[PDB]
Structures are given as C-alpha cells and as structure tokens.
Amino acid sequence: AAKLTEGFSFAQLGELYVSSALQWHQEGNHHIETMVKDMTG
Amino acid sequence: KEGLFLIGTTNYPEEIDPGLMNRAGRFDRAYEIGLPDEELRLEYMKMRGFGIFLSEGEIKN
Amino acid sequence: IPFIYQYEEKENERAAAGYGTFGYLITRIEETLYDQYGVFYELYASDDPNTEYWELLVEDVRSGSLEPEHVAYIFEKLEKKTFAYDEDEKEPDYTVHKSIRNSVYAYPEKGVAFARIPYFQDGSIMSFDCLFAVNDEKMRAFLEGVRPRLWEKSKRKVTVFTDGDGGTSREQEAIVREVQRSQVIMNPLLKKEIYRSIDQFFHSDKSFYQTYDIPYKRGILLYGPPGNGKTTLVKSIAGSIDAPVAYWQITEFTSSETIEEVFQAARRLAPAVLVIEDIDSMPEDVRSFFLNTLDGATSKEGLFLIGTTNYPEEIDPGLGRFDRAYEIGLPDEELRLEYMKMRGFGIFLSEGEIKNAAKLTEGFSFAQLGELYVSSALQWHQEGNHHIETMVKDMTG
DSSP states (O other): OTTTTOOHHHHHHHHHHHHHHHHHTTTTTHHHHHHHHHHHH | OHHHHHHOSSSOOSOOGGGSSSSSBBBBBOOOOEEEEEEEEHHHHHHTTTGGGHHHHHHHH | OOOOOOOOOOOOGGTTHHHHHHHHHHHHHHHHHHHSSSOOEEEEEEOOOOHHHHHHHHHHHHOSSSSSSSEESSSSSSSSSSEEEOOOSOOOOEEEEEBBBBBEEEETTTEEEEEEEEEOOOSEEEEEEEEEEESHHHHHHHHHHHHHHHHHHHHHHEEEEEEEESEEEEEEOOOSSOGGGGGOOHHHHHHHHHHHHHHHHHHHHHHHHHHOOOOSSEEEEEEEEESOOHHHHHHHHTTTTOOOEEOOOOOOOOOOOHHHHHHHHHTTOSSEEEEEETTGGSSHHHHHHHHHHSSSTOOSSSEEEEEEEOOOOHTTTTTSSEEEEEOOOOOOOHHHHHHHHHHHHHHHOOOOHHHHHHHHHHOHHHHHHHHHHHHHHHHHHTTTOOHHHHHHHHHHH
C-alpha cells in the first residue's frame, strides 16, 4: 500500500485509513488496492 | 466528547469553500436535493391535502 | 479556624440600606388599597422592567378612560399633575392630567395596581415602577390581556420603523386617511387574487389555516417599471386592512440586527401587515440572512409581508422565495379612468372630458396623471380654464 500510494498526501493517506477502516469494521474486508485505485480516479 | 454531527446547507454549492468537503472531519458526504419527479410530486400533493378538494384523477393530472 | 474580624455588631448595624423607606411605602400603598377596595394587594414586581402595560396605563390615564382609578399620591410635595407634551415627538400632545410618577393607580375590576415611586439620585428624579395584584390568577389574566389591547390600539395607527445607527426607531402615526377597498386602483384580476389571501388572513375566522394545514404567514413581492405607483398602491392596500400596519424603512443603517428588531416588533402586533418598500435598497451583505427569516428553519408566523422592488432581479435571486411576485404595469384605459374619478378630475371636467382624458393618456404613469391633475387644477382655479387636451399633448412632448 505504501508502494501504490504514489502522489498521496498525508491527508489522503488519512482519508484512506478511515474509509478502509469502516470496510474492515463493516464488511470484515478492507479492499485497499480497490480503494487506492478508486481514490486516485 | 461526545460527537458533533454537522449539517450544512447551500443553494450555491459553487460558492462553498472546497476545504469543507471530502474530509472525515468537516463534511465527508454531500447530497443533492433536487426537483421532485412526478411520483414524488403526487406523493407531496396527497400528504399536503389536495385530496380534500381534488378527485383521485384530478390529483394524478 | 480563627477569624480575623472580631468586631461585634450592634443590632442597629444589621439594618438594610434603603429598605426602611421602601418597605414603609409598600406597606402604606397596601394599607391604602385595602382602605379603598377592601382587598389585599401584593407586590409582583418591585422595579418592573416591562414597559408595555405601563404605557397602557399612561394612555388610559391620559385619555380619561374610566378603568384606571387614581388612588393616592405618594409624596405630598412632588407632582400631582403632569402633561403629555414632549417636544421631541412629531405630533405634540397637550393633554394635562394627574401624574403617573408620584401616584398609585388601580384597575379594581382587574385586581391590578400600579405605583411609580419617586426617589432622588445622580442627581435627577427617577422612580421604582411597582406592580401589585390581589392574587396570581388576576395577575396572569391581566398580563394575558396586554397584547390584545395593544393590538386593538394599533389597528388605529400606522407604525414606522426607521433603521438607524444604534437600532431601529419606532414611530406611531395617526390614521388621518382611511382607505376603502374601492380606492385601490389596480389590475382587477390581480386585486381579486391578492385579496383572497388578505381577507382570509385578516378579515375571517382563522380556522381556514388549521383546516388545510397551511402556515399562517404570507410574503408577496410587487414589482414593475419605476413610476408605476407601487408605493402608493401598497399603502392603499395596507390601509384597507383591519389590522395594525407597520412600515419598515430600510436605510443605509439596515443590518441583520435591525432586521431582527423590526420583525420581533411587528410580530408583537400579529396578525399585522408589514410593508417593506424598495427592498432592493437593502445592503447586499444582509440579504442572504433576510430571506432566511421568511423561509428558514426558524422562520415564524403571524406576518403578512408586502414588498416593492424595481429590480426583481436583485431581491429574490430565484426569479423564487416570496410566495408570489406580481408585476404592476402602467395603467390601461379603464385604470386611468378610475384614477381620474378617485383623484378628483370630476371637479372641473364633464364625464365626456374624463372618458376622453383617460383615452388620450396612453403610456401615462399614475404619477404623471397626478402631475397632470395639479397642473390642470391651477389653470381651472387660475384661468377658469383647464385645457386638458392641450396639457396632455404638451406633457407628452
């Protein structure tokens, strides 16, 4: 995830954390690769 | 300790400070409240009371 | 555990400053009310900050009403008489009557009594306003009655709010001219429509609003090209309504603060019509806040707002946040003709001459028909001759 987050601000890595946290806490599933690719686009 | 839930309103989303948006703190989701479609207009007219003086067909019309 | 101050007070040093005079006056006011009415009045406000019903008291005394009875003077050698005359008001009142300060008054049927107790300090003469009642139920009924009395009294008046640097200035004015509905010169179809709201809001039973579940408020915008007499029209509409009328004069001092003052003061006269002329003159930094007072989450009821603008563009950017916006154009032939009979052309013209003059005044504003009237009047009053056809043709050119 460090490798895929090129061009990411610290804030964006933070917003990634909160959004990735719910999913793991909601769906038992984090889906970071899906979420980094969706947050870039 | 323990939680403010903020709700902001605007008729002019263009004049919004963009810093407000898509952060978990500050406003993390925005929703558009748009003109009602026909099904919703018909729903509004019924609860509002148009049925007092309008027939079921006059309201549909 | 030790105490620094060990001085032991004479019992004479326990006395409360000012209480010996005040408690003595209150006791005597109560003894005197008992002697005259046979009941016991109790203090309910020792220096009442409320002014509304204290102003009703003064107007009651001033106008010779039977209801408030003069019970006693407080100090033998302070004033027993006063007069309404204040040189700062527009309309002087020369009424002379018994003083309010230095007096005790009672509304004996109401069970409520008033004493304005004088005292000396820095260096003027001031007073404690003291309110008495025979029991809690009468006190409450008296308070509940204040607003309906103020309402009836303000039907008979027009209240102007002029925004200033400190705040808004309230000014009551006599209804020197009453206005019948037949004197509202206006497009008949739209006159009919507006008066449906007005008659329901002011001249009917209020049950309509509860039956259809309809907020009890309204706001209409009257717009059109300049000189179309919008202002004279709104005053004419306002004058046809059997309810207090309040005019709000936007100035360069209008802020979100004066707005709230004016609306809270009008809302005390609810139901009332609130006239707002040239709402386009208000500063652009309060306009967002202003439109919220009419439709926001905490907007209130009881007011029928009527505004006028020449720039509908700038007031209600959604043009829509007023309930309805009506265009007032220049008068067509029949309106021009109603105008001429109401303004008094029939003084010096035959009916044929009026009909004709209505016909020749195409494109005339109401103001221009007015300026025609004054100029045509002199001639008939100066030369025995009116020469309207000559004067309309000369005023167009």
